[PDB]
Design a protein around this ligand. Structure first.
Ligand code: HEM
Ligand SMILES: CC(C)C[C@H](NC(=O)CCCCCCCCCCCn1ccnc1)C(=O)O
Length: 454
């Protein structure tokens, strides 16, 4: 049979998720139980997969499709039928996928590059302007950068995060809505009066988000201004298959979806990469040498960013150890046998535990906990389905090239401009929300005093 972790009577395994750090908890469970285990809650069952052997089968699109976990279902209250929270079989999934894919291609990154540089220069200037006795709050600043980059490149909206101590009200509401959504994953009687306040606040937070986004869309339609950004493409684009464009409601859901993605999910990659670099100074030296050799102009060009090969290896190795969207869910399309040993019925759910997959010793060797960017020196020597930080197949991350372009640009500029000090000898503490973050990660940066382009 299938291993299963400890139970809590009629609550089955559900209380195991009643913790601050559920993914880390599930990883320990996988260390104990192996490549597959059953996880039961009242009314539901899912099987957690950790091995490349089984995950490669799960990633066969003829046999399994993307499932929406209860978490994703609660988030759908504000992300709607945007790309991330739609079923593959919903008309609006393929329609938006077809309309938006060209806006996310490697070719599209050339068009976003200048505005990415705009926000990256704001980060570099902030750090240049700190006084000698000060320090950097890494995740907080990386989030300023990533949120502002998606707002600007995406929809020509400036959140102006570097002008703020307290988040923009939209972000306050987005974060609190996401927290509420995932808090509901632990409530016996959702309709209890105790939760009346939570509900009022949730609706207020949804309205904050909708009002801003709907205004952004309406203002653009009225001006007729042809930016050339995601919003332009969504307003103008037609799905080649149906011949139809997106409606304004779905465009709003896509914008909210991109803003969530571009927040701590993408800034976590930068924060973990810097964490590993400061903990591995020889690797930081290699990466800084590439940045200084490649980034020879006052600001980076698109071409130069594509030449930061070792920087991209550092980012992939950070995604290997701490993928910031650490789990995705699948369902069986039909009755099928997994791995020649586990019979599944149509509808049965699977979870892919990505940090565990990325520690499969039969793929990576014994040293899986070492931070060694050289594992990605030839990124096509990596076996199929061994490395999945951006999900699978047609339901993989549409933002992968965007996230990697901004992370590579930013991290390159950081390494060119500053030497870094782990002045507190920071102890890794990974906070979990929808994403992963090295909470309390701080450094000091000493400027190399290299001028920036204006
Ligand atoms: C390091 C950064 C990122 C990582 C590791 C990541 C990871 C992932 C993963 C695992 C999925 C599959 C989700 C699932 O199966 O439930 C996904 C999907 C998606 N991501 Fe990303 N993501 C990142 C950044 C971004 C960014 C910056 C954007 C937008 C600007 C974005 C937009 C999306 C969208 C829209 C989907 C759903 C696409 C579809 O199903 O059609 N992501 N991402
Ligand atoms: C197996 C789980 C116990 C893992 C845990 N997830 C949740 O509690 C459920 C929370 C997931 C819901 C997130 C919904 C947000 C939808 C928008 C995502 C945008 N995005 C991200 C990546 N690319 C796009 C965790 O991640 O710590």
């Amino acid at each position: 049979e299938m291993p299963q972790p400890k139970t809590f009577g009629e609550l089955k395994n559900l209380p195991l998720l009643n913790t601050d750090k559920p993914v880390q908890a599930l990883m320990k469970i996988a260390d104990e139980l192996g490549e597959i285990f059953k996880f039961e809650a009242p009314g539901r069952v899912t099987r957690y997969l950790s091995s490349q052997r089984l995950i490669k089968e799960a990633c066969d699109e003829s046999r399994f499709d993307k499932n929406l976990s209860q978490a994703l279902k609660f988030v759908r209250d504000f992300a709607g039928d945007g790309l991330f929270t739609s079923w593959t079989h919903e008309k609006n999934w393929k329609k938006a996928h077809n309309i938006l894919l060209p806006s996310f291609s490697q070719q599209a990154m050339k068009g976003y590059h200048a505005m990415m540089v705009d926000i990256a220069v704001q980060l570099v200037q902030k750090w240049e302007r700190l006084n000698a006795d000060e320090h950097i709050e890494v995740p907080e600043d990386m989030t300023r950068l990533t949120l502002d980059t998606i707002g600007l490149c995406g929809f020509n909206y400036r959140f102006n995060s570097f002008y703020r101590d307290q988040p923009h009200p939209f972000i306050t509401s987005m974060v609190r809505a996401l927290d509420e959504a995932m808090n509901k994953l632990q409530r016996a009687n959702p309709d209890d009066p105790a939760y009346d306040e939570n509900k009022r606040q949730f609706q207020e937070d949804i309205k904050v988000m909708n009002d801003l986004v709907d205004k952004i869309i309406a203002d653009r339609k009225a001006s007729g201004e042809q930016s050339d950004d995601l919003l332009t493409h969504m307003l103008n684009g037609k799905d080649p298959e149906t011949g139809e464009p997106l409606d304004d409601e779905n465009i709003r859901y896509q914008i909210i979806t991109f803003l969530i993605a571009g927040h701590e999910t993408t800034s976590g990659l930068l924060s973990f990469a810097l964490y590993f670099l400061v903990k591995n100074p020889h690797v930081l030296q290699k990466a800084a040498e590439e940045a200084a050799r490649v980034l020879v102009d006052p600001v980076p060009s698109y071409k130069q960013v594509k030449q930061l090969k070792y920087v991209g290896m550092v980012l992939n190795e950070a995604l290997r150890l701490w993928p910031t969207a650490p789990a995705f869910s699948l369902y069986a399309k039909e009755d099928t046998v997994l791995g020649g040993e586990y019979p599944l019925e149509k509808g049965d759910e699977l979870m892919v535990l990505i940090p565990q997959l990325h520690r499969d010793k039969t793929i990576w060797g014994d040293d899986v906990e070492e931070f060694r960017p050289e594992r990605f020196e030839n990124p096509s020597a990596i076996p199929q389905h061994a490395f999945k930080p951006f999900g699978n197949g047609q339901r993989a991350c549409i933002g992968q090239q965007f996230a990697l372009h901004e992370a590579t640009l930013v991290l390159g500029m950081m390494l060119k401009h500053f030497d870094f000090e782990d002045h507190t000898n920071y102890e890794l503490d990974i906070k979990e929300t929808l994403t992963l973050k090295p909470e309390g990660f701080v450094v000091k940066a000493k400027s190399k005093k290299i001028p920036l382009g204006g």
